[PDB]
């Protein structure tokens with residue numbers, strides 16, 4: 001290891017949902033990440049590399065950013081598409097059904113948001129599919145401004161080693177009720 | 193084991209999706225189930241008990257049936273709601289976020305559709321390997337109606353499944369194939385059985 | 388308007404200044420209604436159709452009945468759930484956030500309790516939102532055992548007509564300090 | 580009209596919230612007041628069921644939450660527990676105007692009841708918006724006034740005194756003006 005790592009905190013919490021329950025959902029963190037990214041230097045276009053049902057994609061688009069939302073699964077794309085439609089921000093999003101690793105080399109964007117398919121320590125190389133180092137390498141062809149959404153037990157030496165020697169990484173730790181839940185790693189101009 | 197068991201077959205297949213891929217998705221089976229159910233005797237209202245993102249709910253609503261769509265997860269309900277909105281059939285559906293086992297005693301419908309949360313073993317035990325308990329799920333569904341659809345893994349215990357119909361009762365086991373390999377089964381009960 | 392109208396009385400308890408309750412239906416009246424409903428023939432499950440923060444719901448639940456409590460406002464539902472737990476009867480209630488008129492055709496219950504959103508004579512078709520006749524029609528799909536909580540100036544011809552031609556209605560008049568405040572109308576097997 | 584008026588903007592995010600003050604702006608408000616110099620204790624003067632109270636409490640501030648209606652207070656107590664911050668709050672059921680002269684706090688948050696092209700805070704709030712502010716001033720200079728879009732900024736600015744400073748934070752929902760948050764004292768900037 002040979003670079004500076006910033007450690008920060010974000011506190012997740014219960015929300016009052018439209019069903020009348022007090023719930024913990026992905027939305028609070030997604031909104032926080034989107035808010036941060038959209039305020040960073042020259043960050044107008046984001047690739048949501050593994051968009052799934054479009055939770056993060058929606059949050060990016062709601063800040064006025066343009067999104068290239070990618071998922072290998074056409075059922076996920078259709079769902080994400082419908083989801084964006086009702087939020088009234090579908091015109092901010094281009095959905096592409098395909099393999100991010102095969103698309104990455106042909107894209108132009110200011111940011112790549114990474115939430116890939118995810119044990120005492122988490123090995124991003126052997127425990128993600130595809131290879132979490134390969135995911136980042138391909139993201140790097142597009143931009144240095146990368147967000148990595150990672151489990152709490154993720155190897156911080158590995159994560160920091162992605163910044164290159166000796167690059168900076170912010171490790172934003174996500175807490176619920178004072179217990180560590182997940183980590184959001186920021187790279188490039190996303191660090192504050 | 194006592195009573196009748198009918199074995200039937202449905203073939204799944206590739207579809208040409210709007211992304212320009214040839215793919216297999218849950219839609220074809222879901223559409224088939226909705227078609228069959230909607231043609232059955234006096235079947236106008238269905239409870240989709242574990243609706244998830246609303247795949248089966250959409251297919252039921254698309255045939256003209258009213259749907260009570262239930263999921264314990266409000267994130268799923270939201271997605272299902274938005275999904276239905278775009279299809280132009282949201283007015284056919286009432287979404288309830290809650291536990292099906294706590295809601296079932298208070299519902300009125302003609303049909304219950306069950307696709308509950310499913311070890312990797314040779315035989316699937318519906319009592320122990322489903323949460324909640326698959327016999328308990330069925331028992332609560334019976335308070336509503338005899339017309340019940342159960343979507344189950346290929347290795348489901350047919351003796352168990354047939355025992356849900358009770359001693360001397362009828363079940364239909366509709367086997368779902370993709371390229372001649374068995375993928376899943378759809379069990380029909382009550383007036384939903386063929387003929 | 389042909390049929391039978393019974394007129395009864397209930398005397399509300401005097402409340403000191405600055406005391407308040409969760410519902411426009413006073414606690415003592417709700418208690419009285421719940422007590423009456425729970426002793427009626429085969430009356431174990433009640434729908435509280437416009438439950439608010441659960442003032443009436445709590446009173447039904449305290450008698451041992453099971454309650455389907457419905458409100459279109461997710462804030463009310465979430466506050467209602469909290470209240471149910473305070474009174475130790477959350478296990479007796481199923482809260483549903485939704486439109487009563489849309490949910491009614493899918494419910495199973497023994498009793499429906501109606502306290503809908505409201506100068507000289509009160510018109511239930513005109514001065515309730517939604518339409519008071521419509522609310523009753525939908526409640527009728529569930530059961531004949533209906534309780535209608537109404538203003539003192541409610542048109543008794545209208546109220547009686549809901550019972551159908553030749554039908555029976557009970558108009559329980561609610562008195563606070565020997566002055567008329569409100570009415571509670573009973574239908575079906577709830578009539579004394 | 581005299582003194583200084585700083586202007587700022589905040590962009591908001593079948594869903595409902597406990598307060599007329601949206602969760603996110605209350606969050607925003609509680610965030611910047613808890614950042615302010617020696618601001619540890621806040622009076623939520625018309626707390627209702629505690630929507631704003633919760634947000635102040637979540638920053639780690641202590642809250643004196645006041646409401647004249649005992650139903651609101653009881654509901655607020657439950658909510659505080661759900662959010663795990665009940666030990667940060669003292670609820671008091673009473674009239675803020677009658678309790679104000681007896682309180683000690685660093686911040687007063689005002690979101691009074693209402694009771695027109697231009698909003699007159701003196702005649703269109705119940706009680707009088709000037710009276711409310713005067714009583715809050717006995718406690719502290721650090722006051723937050725949550726107000727409708729059509730608020731008379733001359734009137735609002737006059738609360739700061741001759742040559743006084745006020746910050747008018749405009750709350751936008753989808754590029755459109757919704758409400759304003761006025762800051763006084765050390766809460767400005």
Ligand SMILES: Nc1ncnc2c1ncn2[C@@H]1O[C@H](COP(=O)(O)OP(=O)(O)O)[C@@H](O)[C@H]1O
Pocket residue numbers: 049050051052053070071072073076098099100101115116117118129130
């Ligand atoms: N190579 C890939 N490129 C783009 N998207 C992918 C790729 N591999 C998987 N995905 C998608 O990434 C998302 C997250 O994966 P996963 O955690 O498996 O799904 P889930 O949320 O259903 O459990 C899924 O929506 C999946 O379709």
Ligand SMILES: Nc1ncnc2c1ncn2[C@@H]1O[C@H](COP(=O)(O)OP(=O)(O)O)[C@@H](O)[C@H]1O
Pocket residue numbers: 241242243244245262263264265268290291292293307308309310323324
């Ligand atoms: N008791 C319940 N009542 C209603 N819905 C439930 C209940 N238990 C689980 N569910 C929901 O039923 C579906 C079961 O699917 P499951 O296999 O667990 O999830 P997933 O589709 O994410 O893999 C989920 O959408 C889950 O939220």
Ligand SMILES: Nc1ncnc2c1ncn2[C@@H]1O[C@H](COP(=O)(O)OP(=O)(O)O)[C@@H](O)[C@H]1O
Pocket residue numbers: 436437438439440457458459460463485486487488503504505516517
């Ligand atoms: N169609 C409806 N279905 C169910 N509940 C409703 C409907 N319309 C209004 N409500 C609820 O009925 C309750 C009574 O309404 P209202 O008298 O307007 O109350 P309030 O002044 O207390 O908000 C409210 O809690 C409201 O949310």
Ligand SMILES: Nc1ncnc2c1ncn2[C@@H]1O[C@H](COP(=O)(O)OP(=O)(O)O)[C@@H](O)[C@H]1O
Pocket residue numbers: 624625626627628645646647648651673674675676691692693705706
């Ligand atoms: N003098 C007062 N002191 C403290 N709280 C008050 C006073 N007057 C009103 N309140 C409270 O202020 C809150 C807001 O008032 P209002 O807008 O009337 O509320 P709402 O429409 O939510 O009932 C209410 O919760 C009310 O109880």
